[PDB]
Amino acid sequence: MIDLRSDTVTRPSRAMLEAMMAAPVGDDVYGDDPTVNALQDYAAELSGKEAAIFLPTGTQANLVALLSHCERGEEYIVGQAAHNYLFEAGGAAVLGSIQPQPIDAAADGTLPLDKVAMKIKPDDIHFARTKLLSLENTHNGKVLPREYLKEAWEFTRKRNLALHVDGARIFNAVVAYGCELKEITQYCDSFTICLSKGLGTPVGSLLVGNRDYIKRAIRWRKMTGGGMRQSGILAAAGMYALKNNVARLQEDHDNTAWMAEQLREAGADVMRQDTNMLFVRVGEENAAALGEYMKARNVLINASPIVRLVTHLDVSRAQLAEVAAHWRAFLA
Template identity: 80%
Template sequence: MIDLRSDTVTRPSAAMKAAMMDAPVGDDVYGDDPTVNALQEYAAALAGKEAALFLPTGTQANLVALLSHCERGEEYIVGQLAHNYLYEAGGAAVLGSIQPQPIEASRDGTLPLDKVAEKIKPDDIHFARTRLLSLENTHNGKVLPQGYLRQAWEFTRERGLGLHVDGARIFNAVVEYGCSLKEVVQYCDTFTICLSKGLGTPVGSLLVGSAAYIRRANRWRKMTGGGMRQAGMLAAAGQYALEHNVQRLKDDHDNAAWLAAQLREIGADVMRQDTNMVFVRAPEGAAGALGEHMKAAGVLINASPVVRLVTHLDVSRAQLEQVVAHWQRFLTR
């Protein structure tokens, strides 16, 4: 099957599996796993931050990030469509008693700072205390403008807020900017990296920040069930991904741009393409039929009125040519 549902569907390569099999391991809860420790140190150095923490999932990494920034009854300001507000089962509110204050993002994925300022609560016993601004980069495939990142950083410094970035696909942003990770994340206190999306690992995320912050996060990781034991086999996949699979993300972006152009050429209603994502409006009332047609042809998509197609390391240009051909057949039925 050609799977365009998400870049989470990637499978570890033979070289990644070999690295996993050869990884020295220990008990990570005791801090004894050398491969986990090496990954955390490597990621922190790559980011220019003091420390990093390896977690099983991106959802847990985001939850632990918020729990480590905010106390019970405090608040984070976040986008209405942000993953750590909309798509993670309300974990911060349910498990941390942290109040989200969502606002609508601009078309470019940024949260307008004037609107953020309006939502910061006064120091009054009637209100939750606003502690954190949470951004997402990339946001629905869109790379946040670099100038905005600096402005948001300065804004939070002036108002005494922390700044967290859900960086599940932050390396897609880094590749698009054409700069280093360090240049991007200098404008945040903390951020996450999802290793199991376009970077191709089977599991795992990283939370990166100051040494004191990561000590707090380590306690929350344990409390939320993320204290793994011989996790070095998983961390080795992350290390391999950071060393070998970052720059190749540009191939995914190029493939997405090519796919968008080809779909437009055959008459598909392509709404936009950003990084490794293409958004296509299905013919009216035909989303389900489109999904079934593509599945029968060996192509998996999330069938909906607006179809998000995600390119990744397990999809080649030749396979995308097949996707275009099958899509054209559907349109001409």
């Protein structure tokens, strides 16, 4: 089975499973789970932050981050296509009583600061109270320019606004920058880390930030339903992932870069390629046809006019070759 629908489908390696089954555990609600604590301390330390908290999903990581930053009536400036505005079902507004102020991202994935500036509300009773700027790195595989990350950080300080980064795929960006995680997380107040995508974990995400901030985050995690018990079994996998699966993300990137060239030399229309993502304009007509045609040969893609292919540790290059052949044969 060749699954290119997303990097969320990565399954645990035997080594990861072993680390999981041998991890000492405790009751996380009581703060007695050794492995959970260890994962959190390690993440805080690696990012230059004071604390971190483990969550069941990146969606809850963001929901909690937003609740922790914004009180009732406050607002967050975010992307119209950002995950914590568009793909978390309006959670920040629906459950958190937070006003979202979405704006279109530039082609490079950043939120134009001149545009963010026009959305910062005056301190007048007619408006929501602007409090947070939220970013997303990577954004649809897009690695945000580092100069912008720094400028966004400077700008938010000037405007007394906090800055959050949805880092579901932050390690993909890190590998692509060729720098240390800390050199990019210094430009935010808080950020998330998904362990269940390219890092290969079964479940789990982390929210990282200032001690006091994280303390509030614990309150919100409890209310939203993410305060688990012996979650050390899951956190164990995250530690294994962070110590063994970061560098090979480069293989996912090289594989995507390779596949783009393949599909290219196969009649396919590759719109763009970034880190572990490739976007192909298949078109309305062949969209559903291609979907079934692939699934028939154990190749899974989220069929659509513009298909998003995502590489990861459970897809090898030979497997990409075979999918490339099938795609080159489909065009007949």
